[PDB]
Design an enzyme around this catalytic site. Structure first.
Site, PDB file in Angstrom:
ATOM      1  N   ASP A   1      28.222  43.892  31.851  1.00 38.57           N
ATOM      2  CA  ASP A   1      29.526  43.737  32.474  1.00 38.57           C
ATOM      3  C   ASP A   1      29.604  44.510  33.790  1.00 38.57           C
ATOM      4  O   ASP A   1      29.815  45.721  33.789  1.00 38.57           O
ATOM      5  CB  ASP A   1      30.604  44.251  31.518  1.00 38.57           C
TER       6      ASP A   1
ATOM      7  N   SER B   1      34.976  37.400  50.320  1.00 38.16           N
ATOM      8  CA  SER B   1      34.509  36.060  50.616  1.00 38.16           C
ATOM      9  C   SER B   1      35.141  35.572  51.914  1.00 38.16           C
ATOM     10  O   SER B   1      36.274  35.922  52.241  1.00 38.16           O
ATOM     11  CB  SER B   1      34.864  35.129  49.456  1.00 38.16           C
TER      12      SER B   1
END
EC number: 3.4.23.22
Length: 330
Positions: free
Chosen positions: A35, A199
């Protein structure tokens, strides 16, 4: 040194991925959920409340000649999905894919929430976010990667998750055969303890690319792709009959649909998520309403590039002095 381990979807939907991890002496192999959005290595154990164990493999520290109680240390964690676990702490030898760390903090669960109990395939979590998020008190502990880093050939790990198929976590090297083209690296902020990056935009299907900064985290422990409501609405508007359902808890779509792809930007590069990766199947057995793999982050407080996004790429988690993230197509 290096390590290399195969990671395997837990079910036919790729709801999560499990990776075998050797703990203790002799080894006890547990299948952990790696994770990159948390920083605790915790396991089902001989200390876990018996009624909260249902099929998991447990770590038994009393059977490990290298286990030592970390005296006075406790831990307690709550995840974004509302699940939680807590307990006490041992140090022990932990190996992943041939890479060994001695003195790793292994957090033994005394209690786990229902979602963990109900998932027989996940024996615990191995956190790969920054150690500043580790919950051990009163002495915070380091992640497996942080402990291994100095010994690694290169201070990196990579995630290569499969779509409906196994994939690989590598430590200490970049497998140049595992991706196509080049890797595009992008800046990371560690201010919130995550692999947080920005992004450069998105496209829906064959549509034009929208240049827009989307801050979010690369999180292997989250199943879906969670993005701003504007972006998510633009995606689902291209699917006839798709709608946001408050009763179901997100966007659903007719199971008869063909889903468009979704592209996200990494610098000037582009990662394309095929439409099929966005299908999470019937909302309930036999239903013709299917659950979407792109969902709104509104009210989470952060955008999350979870498995839906990451499995479309070869992803480099660069833990150099100034961390960065790399993405390549594959």
């Amino acid at each position: 040194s290096t390590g290399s381990a195969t990671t395997t979807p837990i079910d036919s939907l790729d709801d999560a991925y499990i990776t075998p991890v050797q703990i203790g002496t002799p080894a006890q192999t547990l299948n952990l959920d790696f994770d990159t959005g948390s920083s605790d290595l915790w396991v089902f154990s001989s200390e876990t409340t018996a009624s909260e164990v249902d099929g998991q493999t447990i770590y038994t520290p009393s059977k490990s000649t290298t286990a030592k109680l970390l005296s006075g240390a406790t831990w307690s964690i709550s995840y974004g999905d509302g699940s939680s676990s807590s307990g006490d702490v041992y140090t022990d030898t932990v190996s992943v894919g041939g890479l060994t760390v001695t003195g790793q903090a292994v957090e033994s669960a005394k209690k786990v929430s229902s979602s963990f109990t109900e998932d027989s395939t996940i024996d615990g979590l191995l956190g790969l976010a920054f150690s500043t998020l580790n919950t051990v008190s009163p002495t915070q502990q380091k992640t497996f990667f942080d402990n291994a880093k100095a010994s690694l050939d290169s201070p990196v790990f990579t995630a290569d998750l499969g779509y409906h198929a196994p994939g690989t976590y590598n430590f200490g090297f970049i497998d140049t055969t595992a991706y196509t083209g080049s890797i595009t690296y992008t800046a990371v902020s560690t201010k919130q303890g995550f692999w947080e990056w920005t992004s450069t935009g998105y496209a829906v299907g064959s549509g034009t690319f929208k240049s827009t900064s989307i801050d979010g985290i690369a999180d292997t422990g989250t199943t879906l792709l969670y993005l701003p409501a504007t972006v998510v609405s633009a995606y689902w508007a291209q699917v006839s009959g798709a709608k946001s359902s408050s009763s179901v808890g997100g966007y659903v779509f007719p199971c008869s649909a063909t889903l468009p792809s979704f592209t996200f930007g990494v610098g000037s590069a582009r990662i394309v998520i095929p439409g099929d990766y966005i299908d999470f199947g019937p909302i309930s057995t036999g239903s013709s309403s299917c659950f979407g793999g792109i969902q709104s982050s509104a009210g989470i407080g952060i955008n999350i590039f979870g498995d839906v996004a990451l499995k479309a790429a070869f992803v480099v988690f660069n833990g150099a002095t100034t961390p960065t993230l790399g993405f390549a197509s594959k």
